[PDB]
Amino acid sequence: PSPYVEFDRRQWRALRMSTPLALTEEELVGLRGLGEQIDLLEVEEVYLPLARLIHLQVAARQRLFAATAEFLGEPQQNPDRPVPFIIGVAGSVAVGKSTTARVLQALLARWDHHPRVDLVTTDGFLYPNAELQRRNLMHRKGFPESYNRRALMRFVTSVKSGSDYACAPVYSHLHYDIIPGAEQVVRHPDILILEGLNVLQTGPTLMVSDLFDFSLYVDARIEDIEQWYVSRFLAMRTTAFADPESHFHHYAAFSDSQAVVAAREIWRTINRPNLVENILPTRPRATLVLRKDADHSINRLRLRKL
Amino acid sequence: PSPYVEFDRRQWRALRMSTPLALTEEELVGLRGLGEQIDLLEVEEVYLPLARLIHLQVAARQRLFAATAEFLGEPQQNPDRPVPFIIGVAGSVAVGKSTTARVLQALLARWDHHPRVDLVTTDGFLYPNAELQRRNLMHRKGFPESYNRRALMRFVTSVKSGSDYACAPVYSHLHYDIIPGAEQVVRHPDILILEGLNVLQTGPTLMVSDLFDFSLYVDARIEDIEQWYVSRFLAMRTTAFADPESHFHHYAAFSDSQAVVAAREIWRTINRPNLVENILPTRPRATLVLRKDADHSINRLRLRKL
Numbered sequence A, B: 001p002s003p004y005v006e007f008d009r010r011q012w013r014a015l016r017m018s019t020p021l022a023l024t025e026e027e028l029v030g031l032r033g034l035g036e037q038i039d040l041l042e043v044e045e046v047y048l049p050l051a052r053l054i055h056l057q058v059a060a061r062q063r064l065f066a067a068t069a070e071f072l073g074e075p076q077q078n079p080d081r082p083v084p085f086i087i088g089v090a091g092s093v094a095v096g097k098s099t100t101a102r103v104l105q106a107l108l109a110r111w112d113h114h115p116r117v118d119l120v121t122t123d124g125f126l127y128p129n130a131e132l133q134r135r136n137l138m139h140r141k142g143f144p145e146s147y148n149r150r151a152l153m154r155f156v157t158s159v160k161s162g163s164d165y166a167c168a169p170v171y172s173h174l175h176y177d178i179i180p181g182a183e184q185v186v187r188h189p190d191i192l193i194l195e196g197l198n199v200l201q202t203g204p205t206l207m208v209s210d211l212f213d214f215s216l217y218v219d220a221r222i223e224d225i226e227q228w229y230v231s232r233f234l235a236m237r238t239t240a241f242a243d244p245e246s247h248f249h250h251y252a253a254f255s256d257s258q259a260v261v262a263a264r265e266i267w268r269t270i271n272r273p274n275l276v277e278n279i280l281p282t283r284p285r286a287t288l289v290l291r292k293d294a295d296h297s298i299n300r301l302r303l304r305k306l
């Protein structure tokens, strides 16, 4: 067959699992907190079992650190604690990577084995617009060479080294740019989740995904992502684009049909080809592939056989 | 600062480890059975602890499988047992991958958790000579595009799927070509060691190393590999080249002085460039890098932090 265990949505719901996990209320509220109309039943029935499965791998890895150091008789060059466990999250623009990552961050943090869960986006590793322009790369923003790969690699290397201090830059969607002087600090978390278009992309030598212990790809039909993309663009007319200072402000004025035309064109010329050429070929590289239906609900989980 | 723990040989001998299991009668008579001047002291002091260290990962991976199966309530589509734990072993021609892998195969089979350990070389995935000529790639034999990467990928994927049966073709160094018809059958071993030039090579897609659970790179100063390469060439006049059915029969009759020149040429034009361009940049992808001294003794171990 294949290197994956496949469950469709029914098959997965059917599963007679070995613990009731039960979200508090409390937790259900916190999950509504980031609630871009987050489906709480799906968080509970799909993501929570999911996070438990990841938990098992984090915990196993914690014990392996311990057993290994015991064997070595705890040499001075060995770290005193397991380095952070790194989870990559990949997928198209508008597939909902980000919400997926934020859910997992909250769900994974409820175990005492690893309460400290961080979330970094590779958006912060895009070259500033100014630099991107100097390189004649603006039409290519979001494509592989539009990221400071050297810096992104230094960052993840540093976190995997168990260094207790590592900075990422920050990117503002509002301004469509890197915020000068802004940094996010990461202090040896138990889990780092690294979310981005490009986390499973491949390169000539050691690549960031070589430092991952788990990774997911959020999948859906290309037609469906297109519709979610267009719907998001029109909704931003009245949120992010409403705000002046948003350098897509001139988009807040577009009528529905004018905004559709414009959104479709950014889709067909930039995001869809990025997906076909650079993001989609990384799908088979993830530990877990979650496919979404048109209504955003998960209709298929593929997980690496253990 | 680094994703690796580093030890030199002094530091490694200076450690104080769990205890046993010392090499039986027995294993030393069997370890002589591949004794191309094999240093059994080094097998006991370096390779056997290295194999316990890998044992810990294999045992942890088997428990994680069971802990995952239990949690999913042992569904019909999940496999009945862990899939094979796959180790890659990489390095220059003549660096000692083959011997390293055979020592590892013999040692790791001693545990009851995984008595069935297999070894496959990617040599069997080179295109036959007739195909390489058709492709104009004969001068590139050993280079990445000289292998049927698709077949190599299918084979490893089939093994990591938990198939009962997976066949790899067979390469003959004597005849310098694939043996028509010949197959090695791999039957869901507990561990598969995959040895070759190219096992940690990178590609735009899902690559073979994506299916490894552990990987080793055998390293040494480029000068020293040259020296072992020549010496092996000189020594092949006696063994492989002498046999009249050898593709390189003509190299038998070479004097010492003539062999050196011819070996040095092949090294400088083919095997050194293949090392620098294609094999070396993969060194940092390995879970473990072993660097060997001029005299073949390990002088440096780098193990990925857990």
Ligand SMILES: Cc1ccccc1OCCSc1nnc([C@H](C)NC(=O)c2ccccc2C(F)(F)F)n1C
Residues within 6 Å of the ligand: A093, A094, A123, A126, A141, A142, A173, A176, A197, A228, A229, A230, A232, A233, A234, A248, A266, A270, A271
């Ligand atoms: C409609 C929509 C959906 C999801 C995410 C963003 C989004 O709109 C962002 C404003 S319009 C737009 N669509 N693609 C882009 C450009 C080419 N790409 C990006 O901004 C970009 C680059 C790297 C990573 C992520 C993004 C993006 F998600 F889209 F914000 N832009 C400016």
Ligand SMILES: Cc1ccccc1OCCSc1nnc([C@H](C)NC(=O)c2ccccc2C(F)(F)F)n1C
Residues within 6 Å of the ligand: B093, B094, B123, B126, B141, B142, B173, B197, B229, B230, B232, B233, B236, B248, B266, B270, B271
């Ligand atoms: C001197 C020596 C050392 C190690 C292995 C083989 C070996 O000699 C084989 C005959 S001389 C030679 N040295 N390199 C080669 C050629 C370029 N490469 C190979 O034979 C080859 C090709 C693919 C994979 C592995 C090998 C090799 F390891 F060298 F056997 N030859 C024919």
